[PDB]
Amino acid sequence: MEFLKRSFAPLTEKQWQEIDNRAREIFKTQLYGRKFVDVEGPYGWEYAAHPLGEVEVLSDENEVVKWGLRKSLPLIELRATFTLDLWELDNLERGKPNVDLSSLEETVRKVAEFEDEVIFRGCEKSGVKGLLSFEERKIECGSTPKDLLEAIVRALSIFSKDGIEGPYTLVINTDRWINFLKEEAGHYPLEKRVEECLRGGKIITTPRIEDALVVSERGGDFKLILGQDLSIGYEDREKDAVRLFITETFTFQVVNPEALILLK
Amino acid sequence: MEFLKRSFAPLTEKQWQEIDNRAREIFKTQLYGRKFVDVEGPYGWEYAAHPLGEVEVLSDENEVVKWGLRKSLPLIELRATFTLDLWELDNLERGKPNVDLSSLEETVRKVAEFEDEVIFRGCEKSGVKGLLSFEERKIECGSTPKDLLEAIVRALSIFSKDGIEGPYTLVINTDRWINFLKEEAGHYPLEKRVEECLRGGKIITTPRIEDALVVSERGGDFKLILGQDLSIGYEDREKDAVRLFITETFTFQVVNPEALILLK
Amino acid sequence: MEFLKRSFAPLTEKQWQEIDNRAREIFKTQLYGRKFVDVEGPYGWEYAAHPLGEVEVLSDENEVVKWGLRKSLPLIELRATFTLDLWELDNLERGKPNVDLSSLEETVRKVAEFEDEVIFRGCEKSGVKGLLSFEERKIECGSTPKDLLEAIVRALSIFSKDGIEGPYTLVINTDRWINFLKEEAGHYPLEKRVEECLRGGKIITTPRIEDALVVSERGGDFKLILGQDLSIGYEDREKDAVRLFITETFTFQVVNPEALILLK
Ligand SMILES: Cc1cc2nc3c(=O)[nH]c(=O)nc-3n(C[C@H](O)[C@H](O)[C@H](O)COP(=O)(O)O)c2cc1C
Ligand SMILES: Cc1cc2nc3c(=O)[nH]c(=O)nc-3n(C[C@H](O)[C@H](O)[C@H](O)COP(=O)(O)O)c2cc1C
Ligand SMILES: Cc1cc2nc3c(=O)[nH]c(=O)nc-3n(C[C@H](O)[C@H](O)[C@H](O)COP(=O)(O)O)c2cc1C
Q1: Which of A45, A48, A236 comes nearest C93 by C-beta?
Q2: Read out DSSP for B192-236?
């Protein structure tokens, strides 16, 4: 929106859309949190807190007018600034297809890592509890593919007991997955066996957690509340480059922990 | 709305509307805060916090992704419960015009006093700063009517210097006003002189502050944010009476302190 | 107009209009000169001098081609620059109602004081003669309200003798007015008596002169020639704030001194 001072940057429309395309690609391929959680629609740049629907009573028991504050979740606003050399973008205007945007790539990766850290591990300052903070939803597993399949079927049985009925995904670490493939030596596609024992589910390999994780895709369980989605604006010009920034206002909420099962 | 479990109370429509009329009368005549502040429209029972439009940066200066929470004002939810004898309301159904509602009257007065305390003195727990907490907007005065008129004209000059241009009101204590009338012995109507020196303003006498107070009615200066306006619901029936409650979700915000001048 | 480089400032339309509203309020409430003088319409940013309709003959008496320059009043162009923190305005974009504009307020007050100094006391460098520079239009007065009323009726008689017939206003100092009220102890509203003896006039209390002053509102007596009215533009960005400026091109002319009577 107009708060992103994009129209005041010394960048043409083509340069802005190239930066936007690069950031969108990297964000789309590196936002592992947004692959299984539900994303609540942006409420605007002015959104400040998400209602938790609770009252914290702070009055004495003898008082006649008993009152209390309303519990809410404050929104986390992040701004990561990066400088892009202006001569390289002017070369983009000259016809250069491969324009150097390494600073933009690094900043986008850092922002995606920060958002995934908030989603998975949470933030204590903002009051958000991540996926990995629900220890009561944990079941053990082994390093054998048979152990993984048995853990998956046990997780499905737990989901059925809890009333969770929907598509299931396996959020497993990349290295762990690489290893599980290693003990699978020609017998059958391990990914296909996992998907079959996931009742037609899919596998999400992410370098954001150490152990594995199983969630249900039925929806309405894992909200990602957005005030303003990932956006790029302009701050100032440092006489050789332009200092752009990536901003996003958001919070996270695990509504139903029963739709979550941690392995190992 | 339907959260107020009014339809489950053993009260007919006539009894509910009599209770509502009595509460509305007492609230209308005893809500001195709502006589000069601006009332933002109710946002619903689900409103939790009012955006302050600020960011509290909580990241280190060396971090690449600098972030911060969004500042908001939590809503104060108050519930004051009262029991009304059911036989008296059934007598209301018999044709009794003067039905005993003394408990309702006392509870309404207590709720109005609580809201005015929040508006004027504020609450530290909820982060609201009241009118009387702005000491930098204070000018001295005397116990002589001439001193009051001079203080009023000085307050108007201060308002003109600050750019505040609108209708002005005098929020003075009842006893103080009674006294100022006492030193006015037949010379001229003191209220008329005050209103003339207020540039056509009016006088609000309230037993909610000790000293006097001057505000401008131009609007957009003193917001009273309402989530749910003053409403009456039903909790339970104590085998002889019905335990009804008065609920209200609200917060207060002094946007422009320049529209406020405290006397004495 | 486009000379005010407003479109090149890192401010959205909302921020510009908030700054404009604040400046307009303060200017409207603090421009005591523009409350009784006639304001000639803006002639544009290119206006340079106001014709006085005179010729200053600079040729010798023996010359055959006698010539002379045309007398004019040069326009006074003022630029007062102020820096507004950009983070506070971005908070305005976040939803903050009370945005800090203290620098803007101080600069607006300084500009208003400068314009009133030009109007009342005048400038010797630009050739403008202010209201207080007409000593031949002076009548004595006293510190008693009766003395003020007698001075007002004498000023009206002088106006009638001079042929000035129109609405009359009293431009009196704030402190002086406060005092005159002080000697008025319950007898009658002194402002009403002054307005009645002003033949239905009004009272303008200003902290811009020491003594009092009486003028007629008939019009066409006190011109405030404007080239460009009070406007706000943008100069540069100091890497944290934006250096905006307030500009105005104007001069002043007392056409008929007979429409002016100074008290004390
Ligand atoms: C701020 C506040 C909010 C309350 N909200 C509710 C509510 O949503 N539902 C409810 O039944 N009681 C509510 N109450 C009151 C009590 O929880 C309970 O209903 C009852 O009034 C207390 O009865 P007791 O004296 O047996 O504890 C609330 C009280 C306060 C002070
Ligand atoms: C959470 C957050 C919010 C920010 N919001 C703003 C803003 O609204 N406007 C702004 O100009 N800078 C904002 N910044 C950045 C700085 O305030 C400033 O603009 C600049 O980026 C810092 O430059 P410095 O290295 O000279 O301090 C924000 C930074 C963070 C971490
Ligand atoms: C620059 C200039 C402007 C003059 N303007 C006027 C004028 O507006 N009206 C006028 O009657 N005479 C004007 N005069 C001339 C004298 O003021 C006067 O009219 C007459 O010509 C002189 O006669 P004298 O020889 O008796 O002085 C002007 C002369 C000069 C050099």
Answers
A1: A45
A2: HHHHHHTTS-EEEEETT-SSEEEEE-SSSSEEEEEEEEEEEEEEE
